[PDB]
Amino acid sequence: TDLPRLPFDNPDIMGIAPQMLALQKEGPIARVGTAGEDAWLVTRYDEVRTLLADRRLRLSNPNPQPSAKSAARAFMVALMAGDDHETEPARHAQMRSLLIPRFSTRRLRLMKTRIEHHVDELLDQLAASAPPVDLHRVLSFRLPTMVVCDLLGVPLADRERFGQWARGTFDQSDNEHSANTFQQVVDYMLELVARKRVEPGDDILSELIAEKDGALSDADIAHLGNAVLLFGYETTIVRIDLGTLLLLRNPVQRAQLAEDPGLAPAAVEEILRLGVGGKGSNALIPRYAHGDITVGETVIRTGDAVMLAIGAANYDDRAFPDGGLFDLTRVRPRSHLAFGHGARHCIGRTLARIELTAVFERLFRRLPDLRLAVPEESLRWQEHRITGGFDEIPVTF
Ligand code: HEM
Numbered sequence: 001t002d003l004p005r006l007p008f009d010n011p012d013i014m015g016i017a018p019q020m021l022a023l024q025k026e027g028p029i030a031r032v033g034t035a036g037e038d039a040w041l042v043t044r045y046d047e048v049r050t051l052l053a054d055r056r057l058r059l060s061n062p063n064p065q066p067s068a069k070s071a072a073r074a075f076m077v078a079l080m081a082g083d084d085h086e087t088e089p090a091r092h093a094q095m096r097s098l099l100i101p102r103f104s105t106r107r108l109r110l111m112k113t114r115i116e117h118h119v120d121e122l123l124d125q126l127a128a129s130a131p132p133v134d135l136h137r138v139l140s141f142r143l144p145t146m147v148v149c150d151l152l153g154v155p156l157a158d159r160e161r162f163g164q165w166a167r168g169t170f171d172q173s174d175n176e177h178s179a180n181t182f183q184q185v186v187d188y189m190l191e192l193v194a195r196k197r198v199e200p201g202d203d204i205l206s207e208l209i210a211e212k213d214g215a216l217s218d219a220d221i222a223h224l225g226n227a228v229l230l231f232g233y234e235t236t237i238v239r240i241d242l243g244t245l246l247l248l249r250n251p252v253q254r255a256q257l258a259e260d261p262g263l264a265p266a267a268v269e270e271i272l273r274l275g276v277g278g279k280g281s282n283a284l285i286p287r288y289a290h291g292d293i294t295v296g297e298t299v300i301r302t303g304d305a306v307m308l309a310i311g312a313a314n315y316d317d318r319a320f321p322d323g324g325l326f327d328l329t330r331v332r333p334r335s336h337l338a339f340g341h342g343a344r345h346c347i348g349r350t351l352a353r354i355e356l357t358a359v360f361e362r363l364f365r366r367l368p369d370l371r372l373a374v375p376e377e378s379l380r381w382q383e384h385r386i387t388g389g390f391d392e393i394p395v396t397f
């Protein structure tokens with residue numbers, strides 16, 4: 001008897017930690033220690049998907065004496081309207097109501113066209129440069145920040161100002177750096193709201209300003225803008241890096257995709273399913289039980305913390321035959337859980353899929369000899385950031 005402790009070690013740079021797969025083989029739910037509170041860890045696909053749809057399991061903490069959280073985690077929860085359990089129902093409902101129509105089919109069609117040209121230009125610059133090159137800096141970072149500049153209606157050079165703010169805000173290791181970065185985000189966004197009130201354009205804050213005959217306060221509008229900026233590029237960057245590494249590891253699949261770029265949507269879905277880095281602490285969705293819930297023979301009690309392991313569930317053999325294998329020829333694969341499920345299902349997921357499809361339609365057709373310029377084992381997943389990620393990806397081509 002040894003209580004497992006999150007985070008678990010992973011001897012590889014990607015995939016699921018061996019002890020989490022061990023727990024998944026035993027059963028769907030286990031009690032575990034963490035760096036803070038103990039929690040229920042749910043690792044099988046069926047059970048994670050069912051609990052993500054359970055309205056008794058919520059982001060907010062209902063406990064009278066809530067455990068302490070890092071400044072980074074507190075900011076994340078507040079941007080998601082989860083910081084007060086008594087107001088979460090109304091505030092979270094309004095959050096989704098106001099954000100979902102900012103990603104209409106009209107906007108996404110226009111953005112797809114611009115995204116495709118931008119990737120073409122990014123890869124032309126990459127192809128003309130002399131290796132070794134940092135693929136993370138000149139491709140993975142540049143496309144999603146271009147997209148956020150478009151959503152916010154700001155010059156592309158602004159991403160040189162805000163491009164590290166998601167990392168800094170979500171630095172769990174330094175509460176002072178986290179709070180100081182978040183203040184820069186707030187200042188920038190309040191500046192942008194004030195500008196869009198006199199100079200609106202085809203962009204998200206202009207639409208929120210116009211909403212309901214101007215019923216929203218500037219602080220309400222900026223709060224929504226901060227969520228778009230802080231959630232809307234960094235995780236996509238990480239998926240471009242992980243998708244590149246996964247395809248480099250699977251040359252038969254990579255050659256299939258180079259030959260037929262019509263396989264890109266299927267490759268993107270496999271990349272999202274399998275793309276988990278380092279110890280994979282970002283591939284857990286955190287919840288608290290607001291009422292008792294039974295999972296198998298296990299009772300989750302009101303107030304208990306729950307970690308829904310979307311990464312491990314996406315590797316679950318019960319849901320994906322040979323769940324550890326990258327296979328873009330899967331016939332009717334189950335819907336993966338990398339965007340979540342249920343009440344908080346990712347708002348940007350259709351846009352994120354457009355970006356990743358445009359990249360992997362083009363990458364290995366444009367750079368057929370692309371490969372790492374350093375060993376995989378030298379690539380360092382950044383465990384202290386809520387969103388993880390690699391800091392650099394050196395390549396040759
Ligand atoms: C591949 C890239 C992305 C991944 C893997 C991802 C993943 C996720 C996941 C798993 C959640 C659920 C969190 C939870 O249930 O607690 C979520 C929520 C969210 N995502 Fe995404 N996301 C991505 C890109 C984006 C983009 C591009 C945007 C906007 C431009 C965005 C905006 C949001 C927002 C606002 C939420 C909060 C939803 C809510 O709390 O109701 N995300 N994302």
Ligand SMILES: CC1(C)C[C@H]2C=C(C(=O)O)[C@@H]3COC(=O)[C@]4(CO4)[C@]23C1
Pocket residue numbers: 231235281282283284285286386387388
């Ligand atoms: C809003 C989020 C940025 C989306 C989700 C994906 C993430 C990631 O891929 O890094 C974030 C990690 O931390 C979380 O609690 C998550 C899993 O819900 C995320 C919060």
